[model samples]
Each structure stands twice: as C-alpha cells, then as structure tokens.
Target: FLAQQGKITLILTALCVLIYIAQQLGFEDDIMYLMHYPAYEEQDSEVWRYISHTLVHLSNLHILFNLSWFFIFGGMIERTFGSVKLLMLYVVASAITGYVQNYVSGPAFFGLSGVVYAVLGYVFIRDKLNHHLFDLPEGFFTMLLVGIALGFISPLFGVEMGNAAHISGLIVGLIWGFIDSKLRKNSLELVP
Candidate 1:
C-alpha cells in the first residue's frame, strides 16, 4: 500500500536529491543556468525554465524542508487521486507557479515550495469536501498559511523567498481541487 501510493513522490524526491547532489559536487553554475528561469524577454527556452526551475534548490535545508513536506503531502495526493492526477497537478502547478514567481521576483527563486503548496491546497479542499477522500493533519493549513505569510514578509529582512510561487500554486491547487471534486460529485449523482 505504501509503495503504490508513494511511487510518484518517491520518484520526484529521488530526482530532487540527485539534482542537489550534482549541485553540491560543483555543477552549481551549469545546473542553475540550465534549470533557472531568466526574465521573460531574456529567456531562450520558455518551457525549460518553467519546468526545470522547481528541481533546483538553494541549500540543504531548503531541499530538506521542501522534500519533507512533499513526501507527506504528495504521497497523500497520489494515494487519493492516483499517480496520473498527481503528476498533472505537479506539472501544471510547477509551471504556473514558476512563471508567477519569475514575473514577481525575476528568476532568483527555485524550490519545491510551489509544488508542495499546490499539493497542500488540493488536500485541503478535498479533505474539506470529503473527509473520506483525504485525511490531512489538523495543523496542516495553519502551518502553510504561516509559511506563506512569512514568505511575503521575508523580503524585508533581505530574504528571497518564493512568495509568488507559493501563492499561485495554492490558488491553482484550490481551483483544481474544487473542479475535481465538483466533477466527481456530478458524475456520481448521474450514475445513480
């Protein structure tokens, strides 16, 4: 049961680990140049930046923190929604949040926070509408909200956090969850 549900989360977490290892092994510039997004006009490949940036992390603590949340939230999402839907949610949220972050902070950010928040958003809504679907932690929403609030204020302290990405990811996740739940509800009603 654990293996089946955590497949996608494991794969992604492994990928992030590999990327971080490469960065630590002195491929920092190469990794960043390839994965990081430049400003809109400065970009040569639009798709690459949007997709790859999420795989890049600034430091050990950064990746660790993000991956820990991912392992929990992402695994839950995959368990509930299955692998394909989780993948769809990941890719869509990563791209959208990456773009929003770039537009707001100008390509200085990279991490799994956006994707994590998206998963959180989805779980939050799904759990709210149907407790049987996803059983999330009681403090999950509060923790995330505090994190987002901190991100917004971090800049004042000379910190570059992924505020835009987090916000966009959460919004997108909420939207996705709402739509998914509504569609499923309608389909179930029609069946009976």
Candidate 2:
C-alpha cells in the first residue's frame, strides 16, 4: 500500500519487467516511440518532451537500476523529510537537471540517477548543516568529499557524470533547508 516503504519500488520493478517483456515481444519500438528526451526526433509540442522524457527509459535495465536506488534512498529520504518535502525536492531537482541536460548533454539523455544522486548530495549537505539529519552515524562531510572526489574522477575513467546537476541540486536543497530553518526559527546548528 501507499503506507509501505517498497510500494513505489515494487511498482517500478514491475513496470521494468513489463517493459523488458515488451522489449522482447517486438514492442520495443513502442518503447522507443515513447522515449522522452528533448533531442529525439519528434513532431510534438514542447512541454510533453520535457516532462515525458523523465518517465521514458531506454531499457528495463536502466529503469530497474534507477528504481532500485529510488526505493532504497528515496524511501528513506521520504521518511526523513516528510513526503511533501520529498516531492518538492524531487520536482525542483528534476527540473534543474532536466534543464541542464537539455542544454548541456550533447546527446539526449535519460535516467533518474541524476536526481537520485541529487538526493544523495542533498542528504549529505543537509546532514552537514544539521547533525543527525538522517541519523547518519558519522563522517558526513568526509563522505561528501569522497563522493565529490569520485565524481571528479568519473569522467577521467570515461564515465559521463553530471557534476552540474549534482552541485545544483545540493545547493538548492541546502538553501531550501536553510530557509526553512530560518522561517521555523531553527538554530544555525542545522543550517549550512
């Protein structure tokens, strides 16, 4: 049910399975037909491409991988920040990344990893701002530094990582968190 942690994950898992089956059943073209990237050849209106691309996946493998992490971190983050905040976080993060990808990525791209990683970045920065934000035991900043280091090194090893999206989401989430803290009169102990 909606109250359960794994519901979204299970739904996406099942959708991926269905899409994968369709991929095998000659409806793969249908999958491609539904692809949502901005650059894909299309004769459609503007808004749908920007919005739909987030839902379309190149393959079930891609969706499965993203949904796996989505359920894992997404659920936990929802539990931490409350579902409404989580939804806003997702919307803002996705819009920022989607815009950047439309402008920056040479080839049209698709995936939730960018926003998922944005959550990771947000969680990292928020925890640094407010200790025990996610009940993380320790080394929050260290972990972020390491993650940023790895992000920098990823392109060196041929991985196409969106550092822009990652940084943008992190900053936006942190600023939002800080502003929320101020409005609520939360101590600087949690705002960075």
Candidate 3:
C-alpha cells in the first residue's frame, strides 16, 4: 500500500503499468503512434512525445526496472514536496530529457529512467549542498557515476538505452536542487 502524499508516484506507476498492458493487448499501433523507437521521419513523436514517451516501456523488465526507481526516489520526492511539485518536476525533467535525447540520440527512445535520474540529481545535489533533505547511502553519487559509465558501455554489450536523456535529466535535477537550496536558505534568513 502507498503512504499518504505520494499519489503522484503511485499514479505514475499505474499509468506505466496500464500503458504496458495496452501495448501488449493489441494497442501497439496507437501506443507507438509516436511513442516507440524507430522514428517515422519528421513525425509526431515530437508533439507530446517529449513528455508522453515515458509512458511506453519496451518490455516487462524495462517497465519493472524503471518503476522500481520511481517508487523509491520518485515517491520520496512526492512525499517530501507534495503532488504538484513532483508532477511539475516530472514534466520538466521529462521534456528536457526527451528533447535532449531526441536531438543527441535521435527521436528513438523511451524510459522513465530520465525522471529517475532527475530525482536522484535533486536529492543527491541537495544532500551535497548540505541541505540534508534526504539521507542516502554512503558513496551514492560515486556509484551513480559508475552506473553512468556502465550505461555508456552498455550498448557495446548489446544493450540499448537513452544515455543522453539520463544525463540531461540529471542536470535538470542538479540545477533545480541547487536553486532550491538557495531559496530555502534565503527564506530561513528572512528576519522579520
């Protein structure tokens, strides 16, 4: 069961699962109407794909892996900041990562990992700035760097991924966290 204040993560998790079900249940054509890999020239993937692309998952393992992180860190964010902020962060990070991958890696990609990276970046950077909003395991970010390097080399080992999207998404979160910490400090210093 989901705790209160994390409905965004729960609903996002539900959306991904249902979308995957739709894909498996002969809804493939419409699902990939613009959401799947393999771009159809100057096609429709650009319209809503910038955000909607995260809705499609290539396989059970794919959705499972992505949703695992969503439930943890994504839920952590929602529980910390309420639903609207979580949803806003999701939209902004998704759009940025989608567009980045669309340009750097082409219009062929899909995954919630980008948003995952955003939350990681947000919490990771905030913790680094000593905001202490969330506690992570030791050497967490270094492990992230290791995972990122692994991602870069994954395709060489016959794996496909949105490397650019994850990177851009992490940057979006890092920047957001940095700014957020500053705002928090400013508010605390407002002696009135």
Best candidate (score: lDDT): 1
RMSD of 3: 3.1
Against the true structure, candidate 1 reaches a TM-score of 0.87
Cα misplacement distance, residue 134 of candidate 1 (Å): 1.9
Most TM-score-accurate candidate: 1
TM-score of each: 0.87, 0.66, 0.84
Estimate, for each residue in 54-169, the C-alpha lDDT of model 1 and write its tens digit. Answer: 88888777888789888888988887778998888989998898778877668788888889888888888888886687555757655756655666556532113457887788
Candidate 3 global lDDT: 0.76
Task: Report, for every candidate in turn, its global Cα lDDT versus the true structure.
Answer: 0.80, 0.58, 0.76
Which residue runs of candidate 1 sit more than 4 Å off their true CA positions? 1-4, 38-46, 138-148, 154-160
TM-score of 2: 0.66
lDDT of 3 by residue, 1-192 (tens): 675638888999999998889899786678866675336656553566668888888877778877987787888788776788789989999888887887877766777888888888887787788556677745664485566656655643211346787778789999998898888889889776
- Give the backbone clash total of model 2: 1
Q: Model 2: residues >4 Å from true position, as ranges?
A: 1-3, 6-28, 40-44, 57-65, 137-149, 156-163, 186-192
lDDT of 2 by residue, 1-192 (tens): 456764444454455456656667676566655654556454235454543444545655567656765666666667676777666766676677767766666335555655666666666656656556567634553464465556534653212335554556556666676665555545555887
Greater lDDT among 1 and 2 belongs to 1
